[PDB]
Amino acid sequence: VVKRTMTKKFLEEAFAGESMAHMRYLIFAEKAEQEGFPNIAKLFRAIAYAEFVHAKNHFIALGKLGKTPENLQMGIEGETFEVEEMYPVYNKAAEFQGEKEAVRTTHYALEAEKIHAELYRKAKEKAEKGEDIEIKKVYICPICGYTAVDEAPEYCPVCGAPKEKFVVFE
Amino acid sequence: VVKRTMTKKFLEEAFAGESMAHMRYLIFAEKAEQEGFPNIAKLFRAIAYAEFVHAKNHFIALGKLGKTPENLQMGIEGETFEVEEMYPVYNKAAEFQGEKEAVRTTHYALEAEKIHAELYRKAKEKAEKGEDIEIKKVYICPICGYTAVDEAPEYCPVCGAPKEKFVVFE
Ligand SMILES: [Fe+2]
Ligand SMILES: [Fe+2]
Ligand SMILES: [Fe+2]
Ligand SMILES: [Fe+2]
Ligand SMILES: [Fe+2]
Ligand SMILES: [Fe+2]
C-alpha cells in the first residue's frame, strides 16, 4: 500500500483522472453510436475499460479496496455526503446564481443518492451476516438516474419519464 | 450551458465525484462477484449506470459534449497530457520516493495512454471525412490496460499476460 504523502496524493489525482477519462469515453461512445459511427463507439467503450483497469490499479495501490461489507460502507459514506452536504449546497448555489440547468442536474442526482444510500445500508446488513441480498431486478432512469428495485414506478417521480424508459439490470 | 464561475466549478467537482463513484462501484461489483454476492454485484453495476447518468448530465450542462470528431479531439488532448506531462512526472516522483507499487501502476497506465492517443488520432482522421473506422475487435489487457486493435500479440508486451486473458470488444 503506498504510504509516502506526495505519491499518495498523485495516485489519488490519477484515480480521479482515470475515472473522468473512463466516464468521458462512455459518454462519447453513446454519442458516436447516435451519430452513425458504431466502430468508433466500440473503440471508446474498449478504451474506457482500459481506464477502469488503470483506475482499479491505482485504487488497490492506495489500499482502498476491501471486502464487500467494507466497500458497501464506503458507498454509504459517499452517498450520505452527497445527500447531506455536497448536493444540497451545490443546488442552493446554482439556484442563487440563476443557473437553471445546474439546479436540475444537482436535483436529479441528489434524489437518486438518497435511494442509493438506503439500498447500500440494506445490502450491508445482509452482507455483514454473510448473505447476498434478494433483489431480482434493478431499474434505472436514463434521464435522471432514479433508481428502483424489483419494479419500475409507473413514471419516474423525479423527471416524469414513463416506466417504459427505465433501463433494467437483471 | 452553465456560465457562472462558482456553479461551473461545482459542476466540474460534481462530474469528478460522479466519475469516481461510478468507478468505485464497478471495482466493488467485481469484488462482490469474486466473493459470492452476485445480487450485490448487480446492485453496484446498476447504481454505477445511475452515476454515469448523473455525470453525463453535469458534463452536458458544462457544454463539454460535441460531435464525434471534437470528442475524439478531447480524447487526443487528454491522452497526450497523460503521456507527455502527468504520468512521466508521477512515475519519476514514485521512483524518487521508493514507492514501487506506484511506479508499476503509473508505468502500466503511461504505456497504454501512448496507444490510446494514436488510436484516437487515426479515428479522428476517418471521422473528419464522415467515415467510421474499420475495426473488427479491440483487445484490452486486464492487468495493465494494454490495448490492441484487430490483432494482438500472444503475450502482453508490458506485463506478459497471455492473450487468452485479454478482454475482447467486438
Ligand atoms: Fe488510463
Ligand atoms: Fe449515488
Ligand atoms: Fe427520471
Ligand atoms: Fe450520483
Ligand atoms: Fe488512456
Ligand atoms: Fe498487460
Separation CA A148–CA B50 (nearest Å): 11
Interface A:B, Cβ pairs < 8 A: 319
Give the three-class secondary structure for B132.
coil
Q: Which ligand is closest in space to the CA of residue A117?
A: 2
Q: Which three cell numbers stand for residue A33?
A: 453510436
Cell, residue A37: 459511427
Tell me: do A137 and A117 sit in the same domain.
Answer: no
* Nearest-CA distance A157 → chain B (Å): 15
B97 touches chain A (CB under 8 A): yes
Residues contacting residue A155 through CB under 8 Å, at least 6 positions apart: A161, A162, A163
Residues B143 and B120 in one domain: no
Query: Grid coordinates representing B139?
Result: 483487445
Beta-ladder partners of A75: none
Asked whether B105 and A7 are in contact (CB, 8 A), the reply is: no
Verify that A152 and A102 share a domain, yes or no.
no
Which ranges in chain A belong to alpha helices (H)? 5-35, 38-61, 68-81, 87-96, 100-128
Ligand closest in space to the Cα of B46: 2
* Pair A108, A50 in one domain: yes
Task: Give the span between the Cα atoms of A170 and B14, in whole angstroms.
Answer: 28
Check whether residue B47 and residue B81 sit in a common domain: yes
Contact assessment for residue A157 and residue A137, using Cβ atoms and an 8 Å cutoff: no
Q: What is the DSSP-derived secondary structure letter of residue B65?
A: -
Q: Was B128 annotated as part of a binding site? A: no
User: Which helix or strand (DSSP H or E) is residue B140 part of?
Assistant: strand B138-140
User: In this structure, what CATH number is given to the domain that contains residue A152?
Assistant: 2.20.28.10
Output the CA torsion A66→A68→A73→A79 (10° steps): 110
Cα separations (Å) of A92 from A104, A108, A109? 11, 14, 14
Cell of A93: 448555489
The answer to whether residues B159 and B146 touch, using CB atoms and an 8 Å cutoff, is yes
Q: How many CA atoms lie within 13 A of A121 on its CB side?
A: 9
CA–CA dist B95, B77 (Å, integer)? 26
Cα(A28)–Cα(A34) distance, integer angstroms: 10
A73 near B CB under 8 A = no
Q: Which domain holds residue B168?
A: 132-170
CB A110 within 8 A of CB B70: no
Way the structure was solved: X-ray
- A43 and A60 part of one domain: yes
CA dist., res. A102 & res. B51, Å (int) = 16
Alpha helices in B62-164 (DSSP H): 68-81, 87-97, 100-128
Do A79 and A158 lie in a common domain?
Answer: no
Backbone angles phi, psi at A159, to 5 degrees: -115, -10
Verify that B63 and B84 share a domain, yes or no. yes
- Which ligand neighbours the alpha carbon of B79 most closely? 5
Q: What is the CATH number of the domain that holds A4?
A: 1.20.1260.10
Q: Using CA of residue A18, residue A22, residue A27, residue A31, what is the dihedral sign?
A: positive
- DSSP of B141-162: -TTT--EEES---SB-TTT--B
- Which residue has cell 507499487? B101
Domain identity same for A93 and A158: no
Q: Grid coordinates in use for B47?
A: 447504481
Give CA–CA dist A162/A157, Å, rounded: 10
Whats the size of chain B, residue-wise? 170
Q: At what angle do helices B5-35 and A38-61 cross, to 10 degrees?
A: 80
**Do B157 and B96 lie in a common domain?**
no
Per the structure, the count of domains in chain B is 2
Q: Most A CBs within 10 Å: which of B57, B115, B121, as the mutation test of the A interface?
A: B57
Cell 446492485, located at residue = B43
Q: How far apart are CA A21 and CA A55, in angstroms?
A: 10
Give residue for cell 490496460.
B145
A126 lies in the same domain as A138: no
CA–CA separation, B115 vs B103, rounded Å? 19
Q: Can you read off the three cell numbers belonging to residue A21?
A: 477519462
Asked whether residue A126 falls in the same domain as residue A136, the answer is no
Q: How far is the CA of A142 from the centre of ligand 2 (A)?
A: 14
Identify the helix (H) or strand (E) that includes residue A138: strand A138-140
**Euclidean distance between CA atoms A105 and A69, whole angstroms:** 30
Suggest the residue from A68, A129, A136 to mutate for an interface test with chain B (most B CBs closer than 10 A).
A68
- In this complex, do B61 and A101 lie within 8 Å of one another by their Cβ atoms? yes
Cβ contacts of residue B77 below 8 Å, gap of 6+?
none
